[PDB]
Amino acid sequence: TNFPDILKPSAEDIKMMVACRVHIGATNLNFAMEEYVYERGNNNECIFNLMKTWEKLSLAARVIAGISNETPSDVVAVAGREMAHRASLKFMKYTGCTAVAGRFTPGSFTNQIQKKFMEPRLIIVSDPSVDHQALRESGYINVPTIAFCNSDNSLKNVDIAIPCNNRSRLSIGLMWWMLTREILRYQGKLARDEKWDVMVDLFLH
Amino acid sequence: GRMYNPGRGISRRCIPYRRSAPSWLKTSTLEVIDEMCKLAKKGIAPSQIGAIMRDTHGVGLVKSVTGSKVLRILKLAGLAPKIPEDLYFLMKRAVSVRKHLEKNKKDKDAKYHLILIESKIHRLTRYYKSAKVLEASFKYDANTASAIVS
Amino acid sequence: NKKIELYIPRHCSVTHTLIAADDHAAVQILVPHVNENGVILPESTVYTVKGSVRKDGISDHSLNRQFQKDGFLKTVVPKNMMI
Amino acid sequence: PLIEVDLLNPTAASEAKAHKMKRLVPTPNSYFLEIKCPKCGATTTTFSHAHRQILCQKCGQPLGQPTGGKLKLTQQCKFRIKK
Amino acid sequence: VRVNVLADALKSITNAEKQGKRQVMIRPASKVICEFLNVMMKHQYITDYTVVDTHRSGKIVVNLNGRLNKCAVISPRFNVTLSEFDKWEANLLPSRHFGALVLTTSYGILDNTEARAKHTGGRILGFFY
Amino acid sequence: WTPVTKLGRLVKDGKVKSIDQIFEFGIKIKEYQIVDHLLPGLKEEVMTMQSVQKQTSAGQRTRLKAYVAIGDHNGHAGLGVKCAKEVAEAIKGAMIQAKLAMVPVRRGYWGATIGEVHTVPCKLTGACGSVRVRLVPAPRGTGIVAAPTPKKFLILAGIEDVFTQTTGHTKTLGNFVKATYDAVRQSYGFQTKDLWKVGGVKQSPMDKYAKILAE
Amino acid sequence: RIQKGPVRGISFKLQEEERERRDNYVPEKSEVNIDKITADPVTLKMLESIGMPI
Amino acid sequence: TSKRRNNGRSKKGRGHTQNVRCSHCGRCVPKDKAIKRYQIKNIVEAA
RNA sequence: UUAAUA
RNA sequence: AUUGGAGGGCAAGUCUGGUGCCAGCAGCCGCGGUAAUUCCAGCUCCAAUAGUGUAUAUUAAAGUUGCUGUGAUUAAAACGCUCGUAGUUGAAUUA
RNA sequence: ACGAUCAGAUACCGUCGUAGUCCUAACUAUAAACGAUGUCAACCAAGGAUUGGAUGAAAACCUUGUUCAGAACUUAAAGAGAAAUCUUGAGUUUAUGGACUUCAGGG
RNA sequence: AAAGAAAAAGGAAGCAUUCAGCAAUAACAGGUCUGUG
């Protein structure tokens, strides 16, 4: 069907995610991401349902691979926090989708006379809290957005949200790596039955 | 909200969605009537009479067992008081405040609340007369309510 | 003779209301279909979200109901909200 | 709330949390129970939120003290909820 | 206090659709509220509704489908004559093809179109675009 | 010439043949040359030239503010504002802004479908500041019953018959036109009974032509 | 200042080449363990809820 | 108009508060509107 | 400390 | 073929002669202190036309009297507060 | 009433000082008596904290979950407004009508 | 951490080395129609 039997995660990915403490959120829970949270922790820390994290991740990868088949440059991935600069750059390397690592200039999506006027068809943001500028410009240019949201994040101007930890380098590096691996798999460039050559430590900061 | 002050409380009772008697209740209506009429002779208000049955005899609602309300049963048995229960308890409060007001002439919050209490009495008496419960010759007098409400 | 309407407008997939010509926050998400091997297909399912829906911070949940309805997600939205 | 749930079929957990009247069909939180008096074997049926001192049906051994919202049964009184 | 329960219900429905909600709850249910909803349903402005009995003038749950711009009630229900239908329609409906009044008549609670066909006037209840 | 945005590239190639195609998918217009390419022979009408002033240490800095309205007589219109130190530059800048602010005007019939379309489909209210302008459909014979200020705009939108009821400080010529443009702007956003049908699935020009544009 | 350390506004060919040699360096033995794992007891609740033990 | 939402006071579902005297000019100010500061100092200067 | 007017 | 006007409201002159904060125009804003687009005249043309100006009053404009239909934090305007009769308005429910 | 200051000072500054300030009885009936926001009722975006109950967990008080009532606060790309601002409304109003009372008509 | 600052030494010269010239936007109804065919 639309979610065939081949897209379920292997036990290793769930093994890896717990090893990178992806499932652990923050203390305060936003109303929008109550569904993703499974149960409050012992120390009042949100614990995300890892199955729902993967289901959103594959769906996000399917959307990205659809646009990126024809024109990879129409996907823009921004990473405000320094713990995601390497991950976003590595994503740019293996997919060809334009990446923004440093500070996001407020107007690079709307100022057409500006020399860095970039017209995307999709935006990926590592953190709605940090990259609010890229998020808010999507409301002026008619562009859907994908975000890696923690339990405290504001789910405004985002359309596909990936509930995960997005503070620790292990959590940030893994999700970008897993997103890139799944993007290529949908693209067909990577057989689903074989192991990717590049390991996660290449994405870590 | 409340009639006179700006308070707004929703403290209520929640009748269950079962108009019939519960399965575990096996007492017949004759035992309920005889016990409830025995309490009526002891000089107990119908609001309190039903409570005693609910707490002690497990008869929480009387319309569920006998099919008729508490006041209607007492009217049939002749134990219904001449002055309705809610009007009597309001006249008892007005007398109580007025007695305190005799020695304490400088109390201006008791004079304000006595005004509110007596306005309630004239609102209820107006309703009961239209409902034919009270004869039109009834009238609340502070020089008279002391004896009838004692 | 000449056509009455200048154009036939789109309907938001969440609120089932028209998308104004000036609504500059209205997105359009294309979800391609996959074959049995997980490799996507040229065809896709189109989704539309009105501008006001996105700004309230509710478009993500509203889409999840639609994604789950069409089968792209299976165990995301619980039963009591699957309306 | 921005996220909305089904209104005809509310979950048991949500209905248990709601105020006794703001439920779909309002239900009381009280119940009728029977207490096993420690002195004898008799059982007395009584309300949950009783507003008076409750004694055994056989003898005058007290079984509960009314405290503004629920009977405070003694530590040695065992009760079962009548269904 | 609650004087017009139909006013409370129709303001609940419009507020629900302005926010884009899928379904709304109306606490006091009446015959007039049900007949008003049935008129709207026949013109396909609401999907359906379900009346839940609570032994206390129970509740109504209405399902909305992106179509009811505004449903409103009209304060004191003026006695509307058959010659006054156009004066009311020209005032309350956006055009001559879109809206529909609602009137209570001896033959039931009807809209202006089928009350005109039955040749009868009555007190006006409300309208909906 | 020399388009910079993706839609500007598409229209210059003659790939987006209709301005209504842009309005369907809500793509923003950022080149005034796009509108000139898709709507040739537009008519110009300068509503007013009001002069504003800023107090400075040496005196007053007078600039001329131009309100111009544009739009072919077949259901399109636009209002733009620009203030500049010269009349010539104020009108030219406002003219550019008017083309960028193009909007579709939905109009219908009054009582029956006898061609052609002449009046607004329903009652529309434009909410500027204190000024509020209401538009009511009218029969064939009646012209635009309105003040000269919004009548000039309503002519350019192709609305031959309408009724108006204005409220507020209509002497504010800046807001008077701005309220008329607001009432017309939401004509296609109001869901009538005839727009219930979803129609058919269409393809966005920016998605099906993305391969050519990038390369 | 360049000899002491890098400068934000200065970027030359030598600096870029040094960055590429060091960032692409990948350890032969990854620092993610396989035969140890191990976490607190409440961690094991989700592994068994998911469906796999350790 | 209203330079402050709270009118410059600390007043709420009260509506009369007692006066306190200013420490310098001896003016009467309401207790909530007064600018209250606390001082804890040694009776011997650092010299 | 005092400091009015056009 | 006359009447009124030619700064704006409001269609019509930055034409020429006198007049110089005087005479005066001006329903309102205002123009006139010697280079008057507004005074007094000459020419020209603007509106209506056997009619055209003025004054007073009615009506519309006026959503500036409000039933349709107004406003009340700061523009004018919520009684100091509560009780209270007339008046107005009043939950669901009956084959 | 003095003494200062000042051009003068019937004032601000300093000293003295009658009525008054205080209690009882009786009048007076006005305040920027202000939230400059009438009373009742329905719907209504995210929170954190607090006062008083109810109810589970955790050994009167503290720490947490739910819920009722109260005085408030923070955020809004949303609604409204001429704007300031309002959001426990000043929102749901030219898409104009839930009930009632009072008041205003350029200075 | 940076733009930079204060001695001291060296130097003819270490206040931007010192002193000057040119010196933006806007304005006064500031002076000159007795400088001008």
Swiss-Prot record, chain D:
Binds 1 zinc ion per subunit. PROSITE patterns: RIBOSOMAL_S27E (PS01168). It comes from the Eukaryota. GO terms for cellular component: cytosolic small ribosomal subunit. InterPro entries: Ribosomal_eS27, Ribosomal_eS27_Zn-bd_dom_sf, Ribosomal_zn-bd. It holds the Pfam family Ribosomal_S27e. The keyword Ribosomal protein applies. Keywords: Cytoplasm, Metal-binding, Ribonucleoprotein, Ribosomal protein, Zinc, Zinc-finger. GO terms for biological process: ribosomal small subunit assembly; translation. It is found in: Cytoplasm. Its cofactor is Zn(2+). The keyword Metal-binding applies. One of its GO terms (molecular function) is zinc ion binding. A zinc finger (C4-type) spans 37-59. Its main location: cytoplasm. Component of the small ribosomal subunit. The ribosome is a large ribonucleoprotein complex responsible for the synthesis of proteins in the cell. Required for proper rRNA processing and maturation of 18S rRNAs. Belongs to the eukaryotic ribosomal protein eS27 family. Component of the small ribosomal subunit. This is Small ribosomal subunit protein eS27. It comes from Entamoeba histolytica (strain ATCC 30459 / HM-1:IMSS / ABRM). The lineage of its organism: Eukaryota, Amoebozoa, Evosea, Archamoebae, Mastigamoebida. The gene is RPS27.
